[PDB]
Amino acid sequence: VVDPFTRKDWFDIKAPTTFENRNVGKTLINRSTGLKNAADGLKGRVFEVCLADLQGSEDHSYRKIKLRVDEVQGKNLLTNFHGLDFTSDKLRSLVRKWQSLVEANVTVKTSDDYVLRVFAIAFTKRQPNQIKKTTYAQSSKLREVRKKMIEIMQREVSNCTLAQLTSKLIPEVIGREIEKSTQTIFPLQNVHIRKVKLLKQPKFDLGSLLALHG
Amino acid sequence: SQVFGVARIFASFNDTFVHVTDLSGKETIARVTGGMKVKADRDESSPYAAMLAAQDVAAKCKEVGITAVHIKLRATGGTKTKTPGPGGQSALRALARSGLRIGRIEDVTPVPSXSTRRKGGRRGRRL
Amino acid sequence: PKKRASNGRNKKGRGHVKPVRCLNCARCVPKDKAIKRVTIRNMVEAAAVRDLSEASVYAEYALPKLYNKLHYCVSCAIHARIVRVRSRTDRKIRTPPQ
Amino acid sequence: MRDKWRKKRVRRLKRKRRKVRARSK
Amino acid sequence: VLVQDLLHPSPATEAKQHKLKTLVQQPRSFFMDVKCQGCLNITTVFSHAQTAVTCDSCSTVLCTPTGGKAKLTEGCSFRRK
Amino acid sequence: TKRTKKVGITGKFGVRYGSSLRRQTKKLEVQQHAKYDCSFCGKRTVQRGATGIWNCKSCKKTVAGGAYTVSTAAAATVRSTIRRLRELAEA
Amino acid sequence: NINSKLALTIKSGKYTLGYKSVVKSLRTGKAKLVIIAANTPVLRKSELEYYAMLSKTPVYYFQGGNNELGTVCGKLFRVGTLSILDAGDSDILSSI
Amino acid sequence: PGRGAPLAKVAFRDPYKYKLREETFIANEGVYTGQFIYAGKKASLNVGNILPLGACPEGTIVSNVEEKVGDRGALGRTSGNYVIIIGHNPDENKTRVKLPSGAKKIISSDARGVIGVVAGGGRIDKPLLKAGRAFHKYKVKRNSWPKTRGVAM
RNA sequence: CUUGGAUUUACUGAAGACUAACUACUGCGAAAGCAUUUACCAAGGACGUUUUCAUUAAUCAAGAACGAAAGUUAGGGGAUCGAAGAUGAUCAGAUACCGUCGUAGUCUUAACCAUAAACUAUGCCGACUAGGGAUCGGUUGUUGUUCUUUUAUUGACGCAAUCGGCACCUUACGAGAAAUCAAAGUCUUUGGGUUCUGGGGGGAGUAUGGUCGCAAGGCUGAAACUUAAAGGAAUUGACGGAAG
Ligand SMILES: O[C@H](c1cc(C(F)(F)F)nc2c(C(F)(F)F)cccc12)[C@@H]1CCCCN1
Ligand SMILES: [Zn+2]
Ligand SMILES: [Zn+2]
CA distances from H61 to F51, F71, H30, H69 (A): 21, 16, 14, 19
Count of CA atoms in the C-beta half-sphere (13 A) of C60:
3
Which of C61, C62, C67 is facing A92, going by the closest CB pair?
A: C67
Q: Regarding beta strands B16-21 and B28-33, do their DSSP bridges make them parallel or antiparallel, or are they unpaired?
A: antiparallel
Contact B87, B10 (CB under 8 A): no
Identify any residues that bridge with A69 across adjacent strands, giving them in sequence order. Answer: A79
The CA-based angle B79-C81-C24, given to 5 degrees, is 15
Q: Where would I find the beta strands (DSSP E) of chain B? A: 4-11, 16-21, 28-33, 68-74, 101-107
- Segment holding G69, helix H or strand E: helix G66-72
DSSP assignment of E34-46 equals EEESS-SS-EEEE
- Segment holding C19, helix H or strand E: strand C19-21
B27/A26 CB distance under 8 A: no
Work out the number of other CB atoms within 10 angstroms of the CB of residue D2: 7
Per-residue DSSP letter, F4: -
Length of chain B: 127
Dihedral angle, C-alpha A119, A120, A124, A125, nearest 10 °: 140
Cis ω on the peptide bond leading into residue H146 (within 30° of 0)? yes
Taking chain C, what is the end-to-end CA distance rounded to the nearest angstrom?
Answer: 31
Residues 6+ apart with CB under 8 A from H91: none
C73 burial (CB, 10 Å; 0-12 / 13-18 / 19+) is buried
Write the secondary structure of F5-72 as one string of H (helix), E (strand) and C (coil): CCCHHHHHHCCCCCHHHHHHHHHHHHHHCCCECCCCCCCCCEEECCCCEEEECCCCCEEECCCCCCCC
Q: At what angle do helices B47-64 and B87-97 cross, to 10 degrees?
A: 40
Work out the number of other CB atoms within 10 angstroms of the CB of residue G73: 19
Q: Which of H60, H55, H61, H50 lies closest to H25, judged by CA? A: H50
CA distances from C76 to C21, C22, C82, H2 (A): 12, 8, 8, 69
- Kindly tell me the sign of the dihedral angle through the C-alpha atoms of A201, A202, A203, A207: negative
Q: At what angle do helices A139-158 and A162-169 cross, to 10 degrees?
A: 130
Per-residue DSSP letter, G67: H
- Kindly tell me the sign of the dihedral angle through the C-alpha atoms of A22, A24, A25, A27: negative
Of all residues in chain E, what percent are helix, strand and coil, respectively (each to 5)? 5, 25, 70
F52/H117 CB distance under 8 A: no
Distance C5 CA to I231 C1' (A): 24
The CA-based angle G73-G76-G78, given to 5 degrees, is 75
Taking chain A, what is the end-to-end CA distance rounded to the nearest angstrom?
Answer: 42
User: What is the per-residue burial (b if ≥16 Cβ within 10 Å, else e) of H20-48?
Assistant: eeeeebbbbbbbbeeeebeeeeebebbbb
The CA-based angle H127-H131-H134, given to 5 degrees, is 70
- Segment holding A69, helix H or strand E: strand A63-73
How many Å apart are CA C43 and CA C39, to the nearest integer? 12
Ligand 1 neighbour H59 (Cβ under 6 A): yes
Residue nearest to nucleotide I38 (CA to C1'): A147
Ligand 1 neighbour F77 (Cβ under 6 A): yes
Contact H5, H119 (CB under 8 A): yes
The alpha carbon of A139 is separated from its chain's Cα centroid by a whole number of angstroms, namely 29
Nucleotide nearest to A137 (CA to C1'): I156
Q: Which of G25, G94, G20, G35 lies closest to G69, judged by CA? A: G35
How many Å apart are CA B100 and CA H98, to the nearest integer? 54
- Ligand 1 atom index nearest CA of F82: 16
Interface of H to F at Cβ within 8 Å reads 4-6, 8, 27-34, 45-47, 57, 59, 61, 79-80, 82, 115-117, 119-123, 125-127, 129-130
Distance C16 CA to I102 C1' (A): 32
The CA-based angle C85-C91-C92, given to 5 degrees, is 170
- Which amino acid does the sequence have at H26? I
Collapsing DSSP to helix, strand or coil, H3 comes out as coil
How many Å apart are CA B124 and CA C25, to the nearest integer? 5
Work out the number of other CB atoms within 10 angstroms of the CB of residue A152: 20
How many Å apart are CA H46 and CA H37, to the nearest integer? 9
Residues 6+ apart with CB under 8 A from H105: H96, H97, H98, H99
DSSP assignment of H36-77 equals ---BSTT--S-TT-EEEGGGSPTT-EEESB-SSTTS---BS-
How many Å apart are CA G23 and CA G30, to the nearest integer? 10
- Segment holding E21, helix H or strand E: none
Collapsing DSSP to helix, strand or coil, A103 comes out as strand
Minimal Cα–Cα distance from B72 to chain A, Å? 11
Collapsing DSSP to helix, strand or coil, H112 comes out as strand
- Which amino acid does the sequence have at G81? T
How many Å apart are CA F19 and CA F48, to the nearest integer? 26
How many Å apart are CA H11 and CA A113, to the nearest integer? 43
How many Å apart are CA B30 and CA A47, to the nearest integer? 19
- Closest residue of chain A to B25, computed from CA coordinates: A47
Instruction: Please check if C73 is assigned to a binding site.
Output: yes
Q: At what angle do helices A162-169 and A173-181 cross, to 10 degrees?
A: 70
- Which amino acid does the sequence have at E70? A
Nucleotide nearest to B26 (CA to C1'): I10
Residues 6+ apart with CB under 8 A from B81: B13, B75, C23
Per-residue DSSP letter, H124: G
How many Å apart are CA H117 and CA H94, to the nearest integer? 22
- Ligand 1 atom index nearest CA of H115: 14
Residues 6+ apart with CB under 8 A from G60: G2, G33, G34, G35, G36, G96
- Segment holding A111, helix H or strand E: none
Minimal Cα–Cα distance from A33 to chain B, Å? 18
Length of chain C: 98
Q: Which of F26, F31, F34 lies closest to F8, judged by CA? A: F26
| Phi-psi sector, H5: left (phi>0), alpha (psi -120 to 50), beta | beta
Collapsing DSSP to helix, strand or coil, C86 comes out as coil
Contact A60, A170 (CB under 8 A): yes
Distance B41 CA to I14 C1' (A): 36
How many Å apart are CA C68 and CA C78, to the nearest integer? 20
How many Å apart are CA B95 and CA C52, to the nearest integer? 9
Collapsing DSSP to helix, strand or coil, A34 comes out as coil
How many Å apart are CA A194 and CA A23, to the nearest integer? 25
Can chain E be said to touch chain A, i.e. do they have 3 or more Cβ pairs within 8 angstroms? no
How many Å apart are CA H23 and CA H64, to the nearest integer? 14
Residues 6+ apart with CB under 8 A from E3: none
How many Å apart are CA F35 and CA A125, to the nearest integer? 62
Q: Which of H94, E15, B104 lies closest to C56, judged by CA? A: B104
Q: Which of F81, A167, F62, G48 lies closest to H31, judged by CA? A: F62
B57 burial (CB, 10 Å; 0-12 / 13-18 / 19+) is buried
Q: Which of F65, F78, F75, F62 lies closest to F31, judged by CA? A: F65
Collapsing DSSP to helix, strand or coil, A96 comes out as coil
Work out the number of other CB atoms within 10 angstroms of the CB of residue G14: 14
Identify any residues that bridge with E63 across adjacent strands, giving them in sequence order. Answer: E72
Instruction: Please tell me what resolution, in angstroms, this structure has.
Output: 2.2
